[PDB]
Amino acid sequence: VLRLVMELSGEMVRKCDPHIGLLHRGTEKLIEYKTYLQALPYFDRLDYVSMMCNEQAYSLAVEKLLNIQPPPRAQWIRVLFGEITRLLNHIMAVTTHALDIGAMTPFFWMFEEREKMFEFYERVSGARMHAAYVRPGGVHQDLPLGLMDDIYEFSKNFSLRIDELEEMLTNNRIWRNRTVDIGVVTAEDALNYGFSGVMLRGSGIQWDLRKTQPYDVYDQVEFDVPIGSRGDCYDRYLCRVEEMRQSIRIISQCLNKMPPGEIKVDDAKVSPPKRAEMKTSMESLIHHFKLYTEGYQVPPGATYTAIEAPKGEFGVYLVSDGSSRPYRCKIKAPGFAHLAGLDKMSKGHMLADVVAIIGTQDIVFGEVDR
């Protein structure tokens, strides 16, 4: 939900001021007055459509500062749910672009598929959407027996349903007429205006954070990111759908390459222990108690990292006193970076095309706030 003050020569434009900050909540200030483990759900819900990659980026920020590597089964399970989150955010961006452009029904088709995916999140943790579930120190409370075969079933049926989505749309004649001529992006614009991810895929330069700097076990699966040629919105749509299909590939190879290691790290001074040793130990009870009261101490320094949210460069910049409270967190948001160049993206079009421009860069308007 936004405010837009546009100044237009008739059925065309001149300029547009996006008044944003309607959905400001003070997230950085609230994290500055809390601990790490307590203020993880703020990172979970600053973006809300993508929901576990934000967990992934914050957990990898804390693990990268804390110099502790998770066990490998935690890494592969984190890769699986990152692919679920990638699939989910791209399919919701496609369907909300379709609903805002018109196109009533494929919205509901792919949201039935997303209802299966929220059933999967429920069976994993219990929450519908905002499952925290990713502690810094690896994934907590692993999956119940009888989930991977359901994901296998969803992979087959969803390959069929996404091929039926490209059966319906994509060589739709008037949707192609609706979004081809709009949304040109120069490579100099894509550099200077600070774009992130899907805009960089769509306009020119081959660029993936996952491929260039593999922050996890993404380096050991064969996939190929789609690139754009003309720097165009229909072309960007094709890029999103083929990134979904690459996510199907990575899910298949992840299910075939799963090692049965362990849930969390074996460093009980960071991750809490489990119930058996908790009810009969002494060191594990002490670690449970003080780890949930104070929060583990984090060495001083300022770090930055960034992973590939389905929007783009989800960056997180931590600044830590030697403490259990972070001194200053800050979030590089691809929604903010994409909204930053709206005048130069929409200097020569009309208002329905502007609504299509707001659609063709995936928006949540929560993450754009920081």
Partner: protein, 176 residues
């Protein structure tokens, strides 16, 4: 590795160009879309009759915020303030006193249903499993006064059932 799109040309052969002209002047793949949508018409739709059929769930749903108690025993809570120490919107409010017996207990144990984001941290933080996220999710409350639970409301809500809560925990006390 990359697999890009939109690298072709319209074929200059006569058959392909007259097929594109036939689609242009004959409205063909539009009717193909109509055929696909009628194929979904002749399916049976997947709906649930809501007041009679309730949608499926997991044994680890997070709902009601109920309490538990000992087998034929007293209140399971100690007032050890871990849930208010972890509560990420601080909706827990604990004021504790011991009674005339000697075991440490409470005075005031309040959950704000407005602030409760329903994490599960107070369930995971409870050392004795006193507070448990409940099974049912039907609050639907006409007044804002009534959405502020007291400890006695929580005890009545934990004594309207335990057998559901006990069955869910006894099924899944091994994962967590």
């Amino acid at each position: 590795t990359y697999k890009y799109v939109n690298l072709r040309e319209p074929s200059m052969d006569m058959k392909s160009v007259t097929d594109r002209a036939a689609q242009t002047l004959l409205w063909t793949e539009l009717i193909r879309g109509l055929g696909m949508t009628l194929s979904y018409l002749f399916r049976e739709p997947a709906t649930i009759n809501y007041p009679f059929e309730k949608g499926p769930l997991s044994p680890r749903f997070r709902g009601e915020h109920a309490l538990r108690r000992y087998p034929s025993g007293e209140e399971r809570c100690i007032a050890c303030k871990l849930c208010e120490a972890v509560c990420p919107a601080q909706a827990i409010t604990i004021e504790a006193e011991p009674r005339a017996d000697g075991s440490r207990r409470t005075t005031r144990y309040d959950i704000d249903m407005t602030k409760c984001i329903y994490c599960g941290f107070c369930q995971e933080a409870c050392p004795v499993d006193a507070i448990v996220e409940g099974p049912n999710f039907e609050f639907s409350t006409e007044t804002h006064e009534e959405l502020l639970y007291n400890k006695e409301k929580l005890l009545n809500n934990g004594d309207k059932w335990e057998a559901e809560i006990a069955a869910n925990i006894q099924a899944d006390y091994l994962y967590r």
